[PDB]
Design a binder for this molecule. Structure first.
Ligand SMILES: [Cl-]
Ligand SMILES: [Cl-]
Lengths: 472, 470
């Protein structure tokens, strides 16, 4: 068996009843997922309230803007450090190792569950560039471990039990039942049984039903698009969706390389590392103060749409309107233009997300890279709509739709970081439409073919950083 | 290697180079699939040209109606026995056996390819209730085998090339690039590498690109629906979509049992089996004459929409209109109503498809059971829309064509033991608005069917005496 060792970032490792189980697994992870999302929304509304409540100086608005996220990230790192140090980072590298028959000593205990749920809520409620896909795979796996201990060779049934929980975790994260099952298979395994695809599809369907009940009866796609079904794209637009796929493959390989290079450079410093490992809370507080200072809207933040939340940013990039011809006018500052505001957002969010993904809190990385791909897809789509203002064809009614290039760019960059093709299925379930299926599949295959030639996936790069037993 | 043996019905058996390959495999199966769909549409247009001319009397109309399909099926059966007897039936049971490392003597040869392509074109050019999912899995596997011999660790590379070919064949059959990859994995394997799911998705994307070019050079979704995006179904309707799944579970198990029972009765009836074996073409001709006599429109065919083609039938069932308040007209003859015509269609097409899939021709079974499920779904949707005329909530109305999409996916899932018929139904219709109803019905249909019977493809492995593992 292996046991956890702390360092400043990720740390290291050292040294019938089945229907009942899958229905109760689907019920628990939907209730736990709904409670976490309610508490994250309440934290983001409190930042808006304390900001909106005052106008006396730009200095008081600045101190309110930077203090709130630094306090939430300091509490997240410190509370996680006291209860369960093994709860920092994403959960996918460890669950991939546990399903391979390796034992990690205290990874699925009740203290680790309490450290994940409280630590993830404070990390996401700050507004830092953080995701939740990996943390949800570990929280679902702890629901399964505790539920199978309650519902009292069984090691094979344990592996069978944890694999269905990994499928439920991703499905609850995106509200995407089929794409979540298929993505969990691509990231947690190398060969997978058709039986465990059926057990995953069964449990994800019951969670989708509990979300549909909670969403209407006691108060659907998360980012609903409204594109036309008649001629959404021309045959002559296909070369541009192929450029998005190739450029996403080079960008997704660069992201994984940058995230590893940030970890390797601080492990090599003598005095800096030996100081910060005594001053444990100083590194997460300094990174949060840097990022929060640059997103401050009255200063530099207006040139990168810094006033939008992670949800509002993605709701605007997918809109059914052409900008070159909480609202889409955040991309159009008085002293700038749409093209410059997209280019600055892409360059700033790229290094901010690679840095924030390394701090010692519970966090994932999928939505951070998905939103960078959506902005790059808008940059190409608005550029096409500025070059062809009366449409791409001479015949002459149907104009270009830049929001459909954003959907393609989101799926292509996330596929190149994770080394998955099932981001295509996730993007149809997130948007509630399947009209861009050929553009999406072309871009996703080009992004994977380019990225796998350059780098490992994000999750395989983390396994090598943590010194876990590696199957290449 | 196992050797093939003839019988009245199914027969028996007795004792960067990877990118260049996947591009050419995706191209060839798209070109072959296009040439076949063109030839089948030309055969179905010639039946209309005979019918529009021969209006002199009911007798000249009847003789035109039954002679055309009896000639095409008799030629399909006769041509297959002369050239390659092993080409009859599906293709999935046999590829599932070849992927487990068994050798079948001549199954991927050029004479088998010619017999499969010409024989399936003539079988589907008749109005018979036949499919092509299995035949296209065999034709795609013959494209991959003939590619692998044209452009050259000799073992296992071929087994991975045949795994990608199974995915391309199902993807070209439905024009459904993701759902065809996932369905081929469920029906041909128990464990599949993530690396071969990527190889299938790559080759299927290139076939979809070549179809998009061909649809602009000559002339998004095969059965494109047009339902509203705002409240297409209510929370109170989920119990009706669940009853579709449970009823499709028993109906999908009954289809597999009846198909086996017909084959076992003929094998045991030794007095008839010896006589028909001296005269092998008599069996497909008399089944085709029986089916065509009942589908003849001026007779009994009125009461089961017998004047529609298989494509027109599915386009009428999936439309955005409510019939109780061609798309209504063929289902609403002057002597009856739409409910009675849906019930007679379901009960007649059930035994006709179970019988027709046993005859000595290249044929599949997916579109035959998908069309029965679509009608059973329409019956529940039109009954809900008749019971709740102002809508179910105290004021959007019910969409009967959305229940047809659920029933089509659920019955085809229960016959094949698959869940990927959900992904296939979104790619065939070009909408994903019914995803929760579809998944509820498909999971309920699978849990009921797997408790009662094997899959259709596992049942054929047992009938043909092939190597089996439950
Ligand atoms: Cl996320
Ligand atoms: Cl078919």
């Amino acid at each position: 068996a292996l046991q956890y060792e702390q360092t400043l970032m990720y740390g290291r490792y050292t040294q019938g009843e089945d229907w009942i189980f899958l229905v109760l697994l689907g019920l628990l992870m939907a209730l736990v997922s709904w409670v976490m999302d309610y508490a994250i929304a309440a934290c983001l509304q409190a930042q808006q309230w304390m900001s909106r409540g005052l106008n006396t100086s730009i200095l008081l608005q600045y101190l309110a803007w930077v203090t709130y996220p630094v306090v939430l990230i300091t509490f997240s790192a410190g509370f996680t450090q006291i209860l369960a140090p093994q709860a920092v980072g994403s959960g996918i590298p460890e669950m991939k190792t546990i399903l391979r028959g390796v034992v990690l000593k205290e990874y699925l205990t009740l203290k680790t569950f309490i450290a994940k749920v409280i630590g993830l809520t404070c990390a996401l409620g700050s507004g830092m560039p953080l995701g939740k896909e990996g943390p949800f795979v570990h929280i679902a796996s702890m629901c399964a471990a505790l539920l199978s201990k309650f519902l009292s060779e069984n090691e094979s049934r344990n592996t069978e039990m944890l694999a269905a929980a990994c499928a439920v975790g991703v499905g609850c994260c995106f509200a995407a039942p089929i794409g979540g099952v298929l993505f969990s298979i691509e990231v947690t395994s190398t060969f997978f049984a058709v039986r465990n695809y059926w057990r995953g599809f069964f449990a994800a369907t019951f969670s989708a039903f509990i979300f549909r009940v909670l969403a209407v009866w006691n108060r659907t796609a998360l980012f609903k698009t409204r594109f036309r079904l008649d001629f959404p794209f021309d045959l002559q637009e296909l070369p541009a969706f192929a450029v998005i796929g190739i450029a996403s493959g080079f960008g997704g390989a660069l992201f994984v390389y940058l995230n590893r290079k940030i970890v390797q450079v601080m492990r090599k410093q003598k005095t800096i590392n030996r100081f910060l490992m005594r001053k444990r809370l100083l590194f997460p507080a300094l990174v949060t103060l840097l990022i929060s200072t640059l997103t401050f809207p009255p200063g530099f933040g207006q040139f990168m749409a810094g006033q939008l939340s992670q949800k509002e940013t993605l709701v605007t990039l997918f809109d059914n309107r052409t900008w070159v011809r909480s609202t889409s006018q955040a991309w159009n500052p008085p002293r700038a233009n749409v093209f410059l505001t997209l280019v600055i957002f892409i360059l700033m969010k790229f290094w901010m997300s690679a840095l924030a993904t390394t701090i010692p809190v519970p966090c994932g990385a999928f939505m951070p890279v998905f939103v960078i791909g959506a902005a790059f897809g808008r940059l190409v789509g608005e550029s096409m709509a500025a070059w062809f203002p009366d449409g791409i064809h001479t015949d002459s009614t149907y104009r270009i739709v830049p929001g459909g290039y954003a959907v393609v760019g989101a799926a292509a960059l996330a596929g190149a970081v994770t080394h998955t093709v099932s981001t295509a299925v996730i993007v149809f379930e997130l948007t509630g439409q399947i009209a861009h299926i050929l553009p999406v599949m072309i871009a996703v295959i080009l992004a994977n073919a380019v990225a796998q030639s350059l780098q490992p996936s994000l999750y395989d790069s983390i396994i090598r950083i943590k010194k876990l037993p590696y199957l290449p």
